[model samples]
Target: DLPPPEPYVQTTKSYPSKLARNESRGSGSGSLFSFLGKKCVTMSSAVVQLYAADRNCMWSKKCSGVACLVKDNPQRSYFLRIFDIKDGKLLWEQELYNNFVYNSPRGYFHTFAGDTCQVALNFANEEEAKKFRKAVTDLLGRRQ
Candidate 1:
């Protein structure tokens, strides 16, 4: 008999993968963006990828998120959005559009794929926010 190589863990992750921005998105079946191809759910304007850990996310400390699409045109099939969500005083936002020539120097790549929203709450105090966020990540780590 013989043995193979390293443990069964992916090293590079799922690189160069295209998140198919199709219709019908969710963790369930019979959805367009599910089962076989790029799995993701549409969140209003953007999509949350579910195939694996994606790069899409909401930023904190943005005066407002989304709604900053410069050099934009109202052409069909071309997705462009300057969207944002606010919770009390806290805000998270960024300008996002699609183009082949342009890309983020950082890995802030755009994807119509799947991902989870990281909430950035602007509490009255810093310690309070951290503690609150930690509690959320900790307690909500289960559905059982």
Candidate 2:
């Protein structure tokens, strides 16, 4: 019961995904992300933004379009504050083991930088579109 699934699609100036991507993956929309071996349970969308120790990352900022959080991220891994916000209220906040959200679990990628990172990506890269879509199916997959 452990295998990889197809990625998701999106509407953006970045990478594109296939319509059957979700159907092929089983998780579908509004479903928790459980693959390989780890289950986010109430885990919603998870995105990874690689940047320096100091910089403005999307993960740290509020959902902007959707502001809500089940729990805040810690100092080290605070960038993993995945939340399901509806009308500015947190419906589900991913608690990576009670209170240990990771920096990047599945949404493996980079899109930010302060000083100098492994791969600075503060531009409109080809990874944002697909990344956003993948995060949605998992992050906003629930309503509890």
Candidate 3:
């Protein structure tokens, strides 16, 4: 009951419009933090690889070869700072949540989801993932 029912994909095609629609739909899905709709301002960050957690990720290509975290100023929200590895161009901004949930069986890479979006963050290093997860766990505790 932790991971999403459907695999979450953060591919190149799903963008500003698609994500917006998902957010609108998710907002009405009884999400608790529906009130914090303001844009986030970065407070902390880390390097990561953004991937599409499809059913067969063993063969799935990487979505963002290089990505980073942009912890929001309020500490109540965050987003993924996706980028192009070769050109070093910032590709996308994926917002995330406060009603997040996760469980370990999925793998070392932390997969969490809110009402709006689901994320499976594969940190560049395992340690980095642990740190990010720790921060998120603490943030959730603080919120409660």
Candidate 4:
């Protein structure tokens, strides 16, 4: 049998960071050759502004006003960098998952020692967030 369905806890502070700011000049602009297919025009500033506003509102509602556990996948293991998003402070960094496991949950679900890393971030406030981050960091340090 499968584990009971986990609680449907909505993320208070999880949003895609890469899309936060579009650096490409051609981000929303269509190509000129595609006039018939698609007109080459820069998206209106208003449109961009509207989208940014919407994203900010959605993020505010979803994220618990804190950003933790920024992850980067390098060569072998997944590198995780935890930070204080509000103040732009680095908390800790760790590399996890240097091996593979079958018949088990992938990445986030796999057990590190006996502790589960996925449930490390379920918190209601900043205090809880810090506590979880510390716990995860300690666990990783001990494992490594």
**Best model per TM-score:** 3
Error of 1 at 51 (Å): 31
lDDT for model 2, please.
Answer: 0.28
Best candidate according to lDDT: 3
TM-score of 2: 0.19
| Residue 97 miss distance in model 3 (angstroms) | 3.6
Pairs clashing in candidate 3? none
Stretches of model 4 off by over 4 angstroms after superposition: 1-74, 100-119, 123-144
> Pairing residues by index, what is the TM-score of model 4?
0.24
Relative to the unseen true structure, what is the C-alpha lDDT of residue 105 in candidate 1, on a scale of 0 to 100? 22
Order the candidates by lDDT, highest first: 3, 4, 2, 1
Comparing 1 and 4 on lDDT, the stronger one: 4
For model 4 the local lDDT of residue 14 reads 18
lDDT tens readout by residue for model 2, 2-28: 112222234232111111133222222
**Model 3 root-mean-square deviation:** 8.5
- Which model, 1 or 3, shows the larger TM-score? 3
lDDT of prediction 4:
0.28
Q: Give the Å error, residue 93, model 2.
A: 0.7
Report the number of backbone clashes for model 2: 4
Worst 10 residues of 1 by lDDT: 1-10
